[PDB]
């Protein structure tokens, strides 16, 4: 987005330089140049109308990152506690399938 | 002094990120000496964050790790090796950037 | 001239040709001036250097980037129209050099405002990403919780299966 | 200065500013080992918009011979006895902003053959070492069918016909 | 605003997709399938030329000699025609400013005969 | 004058972890050979394989003629005590993996006819090693075939 | 530098237009006198942290647009500011792969 | 039948246990906040000034 904005600002100038160059160097050229400049100018305006005044970024940034660290810790604990017990299932339930297999082979 | 040591080591590690310089050193036979492998092992102190803070060209660190595998230095004497590695590096770089940009732009234009 | 593609391996490697314990240790974090490449690249610096160093500042400290960028876009179009006006009246007038210099000045302030935006974006990215990470961890945990219930559902299915056989 | 054939000289800053007359200028520099600080080519660096200095009076000069716009720019060193009299001395070719001296036919062939014969001799010495062969009816190691197979082949064809191969 | 306070912010590695191989003219390749359930069998599968333990040195040396021979032949075949090549004979003269020849010849003959004598004696 | 985008995930990977997760890995895959597993996982995979072979086995219709099978921790060891001996095994997923007929030892070993020898040329044994194996790679009734 | 060929000039228009590009334009954002840290010294109001995470904040978490469609930072906004078929496509601000 | 059942439910189980163990091994284990809203922005300025990894 920001790279597009910089390129658009640089091009806004491109159509100025190019316009004046063409002039020094017929009516359709000036018409298309004018349309080009106006189009890209309006695009730069509507693109600037995007990035905001903005706020926080620290006060709220710091608070949010601290809350996120706490919640990441608690979520890691929850996912592991589930995981120790999840892996527990496969551990001796596959040994229950091996007990069945041993009893079938012993026959 | 230790300052000159730090500066020269930083320059050397940043220079190691060049496949041309790596092929230079490999052809000139510097890798075959058992002194250079110990110097490389000592150079691993750059992985620390306090030392990595001063690295302008970060692409070197990963490369350094490869140099420890002891099979990367036996090869790379070829020029086709430097060719291929620089090709893949610049390809990853430029294609990642410009492909993200072009994909975003083309999808935004086509969806409209 | 005399120099080749740089002097080859020397000094530190000579030192390194030792054994067990003899080689020198790593250098300390020189927190001052260094010489990477050719630039000094000294430590302790900012991200977007103030435009006050090196150029004039046409914008007050209120700096409401969104409003000033919009004004600067207008000044640039109006200044181009005035440059065309210098061409109507006197091409050789001294003002032509000033107008060409004044439009460039405007194109530079827009880039300084864009540089303010890039950290405004770094700060926002440092803030988020962990919000997406947060949601992904909670969703992965919900999947495991649901999968375990469904695995317990399979357990109860196996219980049904014993009467199912009987 | 040991071997002019085995030297390469460049300048990355000069590489972006490069095409035709630019090449003559780069060669003209000074630090390039091939360029002489004596002879006549030094005085063309002193002269301005000269257009025929090699003819009327003469001397050692460097002139572009063949040129490809992007990279290839070949330079030739001439020694003139008089106008309309040219004697070619050597050729220095610039590939990718890297100057080399054109190798002679005979000199290059002979040196590379010497590198090949030396490798062949090392291989021959290794062969003589590992070979030896003991004089007393021995060799320096240091360095069928039971004819019951016709029925086995019949059984093989039988199982081929019975169990056909399936690709 | 001014005086930003940095806090302990933890970030997870952004390894959602890896580009194992990057082709020319674009065309990204996402070889990594991010699996394990099959990786166990892949590792269970795991559970320098033909031989090349003896005569490796001899082999490599002869290969290198052959390669140099081939390169010279290639350059000679590229001179055989005017395709991307030249042959202009710049009237020059390899002037050796020494008695290199005599000395060279002498030393060469000496060492070659040394090798010969050594071999003979040994045998 | 234009200033560009920040490293962002790249800088994160730099400062925290060191293993560069960007660019291509083909460097390591083409230049560096893989490191081998130790006994810890060698035999671990061996026993997971025991288990899966057990599954495939209880899944087919083993011949009632003999089918003397022992897991041998890696091979079913299908052995007639009569004149044939084979060791079939699987290579992966139970739905569609083919079989592997590693050994084709012939049990018919008489000491009155063949003294200090086998009973058939090894090459003819190696022919059934690629023939019955290609027949079982059909995946149609392999145990009976 | 003469250029000015009808063909050479025509290439310039297409290249320049491609990079740049009923209102369908983003909703005008009124200026906020107090910012979250310096302006309102509100410091962290847990409410602000909750609002950014899930609520729609017009400029902190997204761009409102007109027609009501809400575009978050990761998403790409397609809009048509000029009264013409051609539409400005605004690529994602964050672009997190 | 019970074996087909165990296999399907527990292949799902292997995938879930694997999400969990990706966790145990890495994600949701180290959780180190060392260096963040300071040095990374500095490195931002750094590689932006270095158009080779930029």
Interface test with A, best of E5, E6, E7 (most A CBs within 10 A): E7
Q: Is E15 on the interface with B (CB under 8 A)?
A: no
- E94 contacts in D (CB within 8 Å)? 104, 107
Q: Which of B100, B101, B111 sits opposite G78 (nearest CB)?
A: B111
Gap from A37 CA to chain G (nearest CA, Å)? 10
Q: Do A80 and H28 touch (CB under 8 A)?
A: yes
**Resolution in angstrom units:** 4.1
Pick from C16, C27, C28: CB nearest B39 = C16
Q: CB E13 to CB F16 under 8 A?
A: yes
**Residue A28 near chain G (CB below 8 Å):** no
Select from F111, F108, F144 the least CA-distant residue to F125: F108
Q: Give how far Cα C100 sits from Cα of A24, F11, F20, Å.
A: 16, 40, 47
Count how many pairs of residues, chain A against chain H, have C-beta atoms within 8 Å: 52
When scoring E3, E5, E11 by the number of chain H Cβ atoms within 10 A, the one with the most, hence best to mutate, is: E11
Cβ atoms of A5 and C114 within 8 Å: the answer is yes
**One-letter-per-residue 3-state SS of chain F:** CCCCCCCCHHHHHHHCCCCCCCCCCHHHHHHCCCCCCCHHHHHHHHHHHHHHHHHHHHHCCCCCCCCECCCCCCCCCCECCCCCECCEEECCCCCCCCEEECCCCCCCCCCCCCCCCCCCCHHHHHHHHHHHHHHHCCCCCCCCC
Query: Distance between CA F74 and CA F43 in Å, rounded?
Result: 10
Chains in touch with C (≥3 Cβ pairs < 8 A): A, B, E, F, G, H
Distance (Å, whole) CA E76 – CA E62: 21
Q: Do G93 and C128 touch (CB under 8 A)?
A: no
Closest CA to C114 of G32, A9, A56: A9
Of H15, H26, H37, the CB nearest to E9: H37
CB contact under 8 A, A100 and H3: yes
Going by the DSSP 8-state scheme, the letter that residue G28 receives in this structure is P
Q: List CB contacts (< 8 A) between E41 and chain F.
A: 92-93
D80, D101 in Cβ contact below 8 A? Answer: no
C145 and chain H: CB distance < 8 Å anywhere? no
Across E32-52, b (16+ Cβ under 10 Å) vs e yields eeeeeeeebbebbeeeeeeee
Nearest neighbour of E1 by CB, restricted to G37, G96, G97: G37
d(CA F34, CA F87): 29
Instruction: Collect all residues of chain H within an 8 Å Cβ-Cβ radius of residue C161.
Output: 1-2, 5
Residue F6 near chain C (CB below 8 Å): yes
> How many angstroms away from the CA of C1 is the closest CA of chain A?
41
Rounded to a whole number of angstroms, the distance between the first and last alpha carbons of chain E is 91
In DSSP terms, D61 is beta-bridged to: D78
Are the beta carbons of F5 and A3 separated by less than 8 Å? yes
Cα–Cα distances (Å) from E23 to B89, C50, E11, E32, F6, in that order, read 11, 43, 31, 15, 26
* DSSP-derived secondary structure letter, C163: H
User: Cα G17 vs. chain centroid, distance in angstroms?
Assistant: 18
Residues of B in contact with H52 (CB under 8 A): 57, 59, 93
Among partner residues D88, D91, D120, which is closest to E65 by beta-carbon distance? D120
Burial class (CB within 10 angstroms; exposed 0-12, middle 13-18, buried 19+) of F88: buried
Question: Nearest Cβ partner of H36 from E9, E36, E37?
Answer: E9
**Of residues C48, C143, C151, nearest to H9 (C-beta):** C151
- Give partners of F (≥3 CB pairs < 8 A): A, B, C, D, E, H
Chain F contact present for B58, CB below 8 A: yes
Please give the structure tokens belonging to residue C66: 């969104």
Nearest Cα to Cα of residue F11 among E19, C41, H47:
H47
DSSP letter (8 states) at residue C26: P
Residue D9's φ and ψ, nearest 5 degrees, are -130, 135
Measured in angstroms, the CA of E21 and the nearest CA of chain G are apart by 18
- Tell me the C-alpha distance between D16 and C49, whole Å: 30
Q: Is G37 an 8 Å CB contact of chain E?
A: yes
Rounded to whole angstroms, the Cα distance separating C92 from C102 reads 17
Q: Which residues of F touch D148 (CB under 8 A)?
A: 119-121
DSSP structure string for B3-36 = HHHHHHHHHHHHHTT-HHHHHHHHHTTTTTSHHH
DSSP category for residue C27: P
Structure tokens, D140? 């320096």
- Round to whole Å and give the CA distance between C23 and B39: 9
Pairing of strands E21-22, E28-29: antiparallel
Contact state of A14 with G3 under an 8 Å Cβ cutoff? no
Cα–Cα distance measured from residue B33 to residue B30, given in angstroms and rounded to the nearest whole number: 6
**Residues in CB range of G84: below 8 A, 6 or more apart:** none
C-alpha–C-alpha distance, residues F22 and E19, integer Å: 8
- Do B40 and B68 meet the contact criterion of CB atoms below 8 Å apart? yes
Task: Give the integer Cα–Cα distance in Å for G45 and D12.
Answer: 57
| Cα–chain center distance at C16 | 38
**Which residues of chain C are within 8 Å of residue F3 when distances are taken between CB atoms?**
48, 111, 114-115, 118
Distance from CA of B109 to the nearest CA of G (A): 6
Q: At what angle do helices G6-20 and A2-24 cross, to 10 degrees?
A: 160
| Chain G residue whose CA is closest to C62 | G33
Q: Which residues of B touch C12 (CB under 8 A)?
A: 5, 8-9, 12, 39
How far, in Å, CA of D41 to CA of D47, rounded?
10
F12 and H53: CB-CB below 8 Å? no
Measured between CB atoms, which of E58, E64, E75 is closest to D127? Answer: E58
Ramachandran angles phi, psi of G74, nearest 5°: -65, -35
Residue D74 Cα, gap to closest chain E Cα (Å)? 11
Instruction: Tell me, rounded to whole angstroms, the distance of Cα F118 from its chain centroid.
Output: 28
Confirm or reject contact between D50 and chain E (CB < 8 A).
Answer: no
Q: In terms of CA atoms, which chain G residue is nearest residue E4?
A: G37
Q: Is the Cβ–Cβ distance between H54 and F26 less than 8 Å?
A: no
Between chains, do G44 and A1 touch, taking CB under 8 Å as contact?
Answer: no
Q: By the CB < 8 Å criterion, does D116 face chain E? A: yes
Residues F6, H41: C-beta atoms closer than 8 Å? yes
* Interface residue B59 vs chain H (CB under 8 A): yes
Residues of E in contact with B99 (CB under 8 A): 26, 28
Residues of chain A in contact with residue F54, where contact means CB-CB under 8 angstroms, are 98, 101, 105
- Written as one string, the DSSP assignment of D58-113 is --EEEEEEEE-SSS-EEEEEEEEEETTEEEEEEEEEEETTEEEEPPPHHHHHHHHH
Helix, strand or coil for residue E82? Answer: coil
Technique behind the model = cryo-EM
Tell me the C-alpha to C-alpha distance, in Å, between residue D103 and each of B79, C47, D92, D110.
21, 53, 9, 11
| Residue pair A17/A40 in contact by the 8 Å Cβ criterion | no
The span from the CA of G58 to the CA of G73, in Å, is 11
Nearest to D152 among F124, F131, F135 (CB): F124
Quote the tokens at residue H19.
């999400």
């Amino acid at each position: 987005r920001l790279t597009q904005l910089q390129d658009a600002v640089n091009s806004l100038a491109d159509q100025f330089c190019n316009a004046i160059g063409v002039l020094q160097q017929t009516e359709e050229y000036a018409q298309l140049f004018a349309a080009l400049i106006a189009r890209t100018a309006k695009d730069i305006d509507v693109l600037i109308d995007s990035l905001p005044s903005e706020e926080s970024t620290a006060a709220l940034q710091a608070a949010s990152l601290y809350k996120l660290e706490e919640e990441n810790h608690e979520a890691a604990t929850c996912l592991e506690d589930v995981v120790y017990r999840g892996d527990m299932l496969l551990e001796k339930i596959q040994s229950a399938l091996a007990d069945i297999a041993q009893s079938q082979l012993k026959t | 002094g230790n300052r000159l040591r730090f500066q020269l080591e930083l320059e050397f590690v940043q220079c190691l990120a060049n496949p041309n310089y790596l092929n230079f050193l490999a052809q000139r036979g510097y890798f075959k000496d058992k002194a250079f492998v110990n110097y490389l092992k000592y150079l691993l102190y750059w992985k620390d964050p306090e030392y990595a803070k001063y690295l302008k060209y970060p692409q070197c660190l990963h490369m350094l790790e490869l140099l420890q595998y002891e099979h990367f230095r036996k090869e790379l004497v070829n020029a086709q090796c430097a060719k291929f590695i620089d090709e893949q590096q610049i390809l990853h770089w430029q294609h990642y950037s410009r492909k993200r940009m072009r994909l975003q732009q083309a999808l935004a234009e086509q969806q409209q | 001239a005399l120099p080749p593609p740089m002097q080859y391996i020397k000094e530190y490697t000579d030192e390194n040709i030792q054994e067990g314990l003899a080689p020198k240790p790593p250098p300390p974090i020189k927190d001052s001036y260094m010489m990477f490449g050719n630039q000094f690249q000294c430590d302790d610096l900012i991200i977007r250097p103030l435009e006050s160093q090196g150029i004039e500042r046409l914008h007050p400290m209120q700096f409401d980037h969104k409003k000033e960028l919009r004004k600067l876009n207008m000044s640039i179009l109006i200044n181009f129209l005035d440059l065309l006006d210098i061409l109507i009246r006197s091409p050789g007038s001294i003002k032509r050099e000033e107008k060409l210099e004044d439009l460039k000045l405007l194109f530079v302030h827009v880039h300084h405002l864009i540089n303010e935006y890039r950290p405004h974006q770094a700060r926002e990215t440092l803030r988020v990403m962990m919000e997406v990470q947060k949601r992904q961890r909670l969703e992965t945990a919900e999947r495991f919780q649901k999968h375990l219930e469904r695995v317990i559902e399979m357990i109860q299915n196996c219980l049904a299966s014993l009467p199912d056989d009987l | 200065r040991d071997n002019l054939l085995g030297i390469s000289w460049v300048d990355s800053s000069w590489i972006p500013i490069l095409n035709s007359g630019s090449v003559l200028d780069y060669f003209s520099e000074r630090s390039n080992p091939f360029y002489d600080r004596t002879c006549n080519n030094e005085v063309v660096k002193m002269q301005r918009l000269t257009l025929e200095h090699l003819n009327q009076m003469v001397g050692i000069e460097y002139i572009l011979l063949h040129a490809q716009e992007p990279i290839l720019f070949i330079i030739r060193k001439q020694q003139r006895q008089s106008p309309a009299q040219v004697i070619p001395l050597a050729d220095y070719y610039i590939i990718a902003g890297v100057i080399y001296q054109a190798p002679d036919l005979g000199s290059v062939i002979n040196s590379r053959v010497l590198t090949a014969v030396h490798g062949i001799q090392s291989a021959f010495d290794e062969a003589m070492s590992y070979c030896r062969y003991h004089p007393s009816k021995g060799y320096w190691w240091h360095f069928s069918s039971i004819f019951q197979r016709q029925r086995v082949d019949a059984l093989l064809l039988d199982l081929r016909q019975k169990f056909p191969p399936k690709f | 605003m001014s005086g930003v306070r940095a806090v302990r912010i933890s970030i997870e590695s952004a390894c959602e997709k890896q580009v194992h191989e990057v082709g020319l003219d674009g065309t990204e390749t996402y070889l990594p399938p991010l699996s394990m359930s099959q990786n166990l069998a892949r590792l269970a599968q795991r559970i320098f030329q033909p031989s090349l333990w003896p005569w490796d040195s001899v082999r490599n040396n002869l290969r290198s000699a052959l390669t140099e021979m081939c390169v010279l032949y290639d350059v000679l075949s590229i001179v055989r025609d005017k395709k991307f090549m030249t042959l202009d004979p710049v009237s020059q003269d390899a002037l050796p400013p020494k008695q290199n020849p005599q000395t060279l010849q002498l030393i060469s003959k000496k060492k070659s005969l040394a090798g010969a004598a050594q071999i003979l004696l040994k045998g | 004058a234009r200033l560009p985008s920040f490293a962002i995930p790249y800088a994160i990977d730099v400062l925290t972890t060191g293993s560069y997760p960007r660019l291509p890995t083909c460097i390591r895959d083409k230049i560096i050979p893989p490191d081998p597993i130790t006994k810890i996982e060698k035999q671990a995979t061996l026993h997971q394989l025991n288990q899966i072979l057990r599954h495939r086995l209880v899944t087919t219709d083993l011949p009632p003629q003999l089918a003397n099978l022992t897991v041998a921790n890696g091979r079913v060891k299908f052995r007639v005590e009569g004149e044939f001996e084979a060791t079939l095994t699987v290579m992966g997923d139970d739905p569609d993996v083919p079989w592997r007929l590693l050994k084709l030892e012939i049990l018919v070993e008489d000491k009155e006819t063949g003294d200090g020898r086998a009973l058939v040329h090894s090459m003819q044994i190696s022919f059934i090693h690629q023939l019955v194996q290609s027949r079982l790679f059909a995946d149609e009734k392999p145990l009976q075939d | 530098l003469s250029r000015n060929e009808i063909i050479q000039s025509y290439l310039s228009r297409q290249s320049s237009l491609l990079s740049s590009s009923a209102r369908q334009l983003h909703v005008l954002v009124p200026q906020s006198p107090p910012t979250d840290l310096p302006g309102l010294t509100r410091e962290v109001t847990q409410d602000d942290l909750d609002r950014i995470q899930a609520s729609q904040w017009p400029g902190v978490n997204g761009c409102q647009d007109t027609q009501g469609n809400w575009y978050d930072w990761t998403q790409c906004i397609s809009l048509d500011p000029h009264g013409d078929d051609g539409r400005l496509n605004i690529l994602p601000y964050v672009c997190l792969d | 039948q019970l074996q087909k059942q165990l296999k399907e439910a527990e292949q799902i189980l292997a995938t879930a246990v694997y999400q969990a163990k990706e966790k145990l091994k890495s994600i949701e284990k180290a959780r180190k906040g060392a260096i963040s809203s300071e040095e990374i922005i500095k490195y931002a300025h750094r590689i932006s000034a270095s158009n080779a990894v930029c």
